[PDB]
């Protein structure tokens, strides 16, 4: 495997790999790391670029994925894609796709022009309809996965999975010193644990001797390094290598 790899550069024709979404004031991070990597994988493995709906995943999976805005289970999310499929849907207020995200963007531990995020909010209704003016129908806009699986806590297998099949979903423990990240390779030094956080991993490299995983967060682009961050690789730091999940699209 190369010393560095950035899936944005490797698949130029899949612009979802460069996007950073915003989960709003909702603990929907489990749903976001999944629909972002599922969008990327649809594009990498097609005979075609769709923004898969975080709304659909978030509201309609139910208890197999956990508990909506209160948090959930990442492999549970990849499973819903193979069983029920996912419709398209872009950013809040975009009117792109069947079911755009309905929770407003907010400032995540950073000051800016949006309202601050609050805690978690209420999970919206599972509405099986597309927005007005969109075609096809909800039922017809579903995209299915044909496999859902877990990747072993093994840095070489994770690197080979991203290299071969595209970005993956991961989860790690957030301590309060992570909230303040701006650049470089994050390593945890102080802070109260704040929760597990599911994100999308899309590459790796070595920044001045320190090996890292290139990660994309769902806290909008004004947090961290334009929404992305680097975290220490190879030592299962904050559990970053312990809960990798991925899956393959049909056809
Ligand atoms: C993951 C999640 O979304 N966690 C929280 C988060 O990212 N939030 C909540 C409000 C918006 C945003 C923020 O802090 O800016 C937070 C607790 C992380 C510090 C969710 O809780 C989950 O699904 N966890 C399970 C993953 C295995």
From Swiss-Prot:
Disulfide bonds join 14-43, 26-69, 60-126, 61-65, 98-130, 106-117, 146-250. This is Cathepsin B. The chain holds residues 80 to 332 of 335 of the full protein. Glycans are attached at residue 111. It comes from the Eukaryota. It comes from Bos taurus (Bovine). The modification N6-acetyllysine is found at residue 139. The gene is CTSB. The active site is at residues 29, 197, 217.
